[PDB]
Structures are given as structure tokens and as C-alpha cells.
Amino acid sequence: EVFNATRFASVYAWNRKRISNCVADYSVLYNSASFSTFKCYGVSPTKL
């Protein structure tokens, strides 16, 4: 609902969505248009 959302807000005012109260959906991110870059500053990607 964030990644695949059709129309994002612009960089100046960006829509903040809390991902919360759930179980990690990170496994489904594999097969898709995916990402120009996937860069994890907060943890290594395996710990996600």
C-alpha cells in the first residue's frame, strides 16, 4: 500500500504511513518491479 501505491506525494511533502500491528510482509517484496536500490541503514536486510 506504500510501495505499490499508484500516486505518491511529492518529495517536498511526503505522505507518512506507519506500518504497524502486523507480521513482516518483507518476503513478498522479492518478485516485483522491485527497487532501483535496496539499502538498509537501520539493520542488515536479513534481520528484517
Partner: protein, 48 residues
């Protein structure tokens, strides 16, 4: 204490970063803690 490293928890530096960086940080932990011992130890000797 951070001792300049990004955190004072040993593992939380690890799982955040890929180890070749942790080797750098864990210095500032070890260099800090190892010192803090030699401070404490050298105290005890004098106090002893």
C-alpha cells in the same frame, strides 16, 4: 558508554551493520572497555 562507537550494546552494532564495519566499531568498544579495566585495575593495585 558509547566510547564513540554507534552503540554500547555489542550485538546491536553487529546486527545493524555488515561485520567488516563492526570490526572498526568494536575497536572503539574494546579500546574503551579495555582502557576502563586498566583504569579500574591500576586503581585496585594502588588501593591494594
Amino acid at each position: 558508554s558509547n566510547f564513540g562507537a554507534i552503540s554500547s550494546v555489542l550485538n546491536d552494532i553487529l546486527s545493524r551493520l555488515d561485520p567488516p564495519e563492526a570490526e572498526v566499531q568494536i575497536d572503539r568498544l574494546i579500546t574503551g572497555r579495555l582502557q576502563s579495566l586498566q583504569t579500574y585495575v591500576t586503581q585496585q593495585l594502588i588501593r591494594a
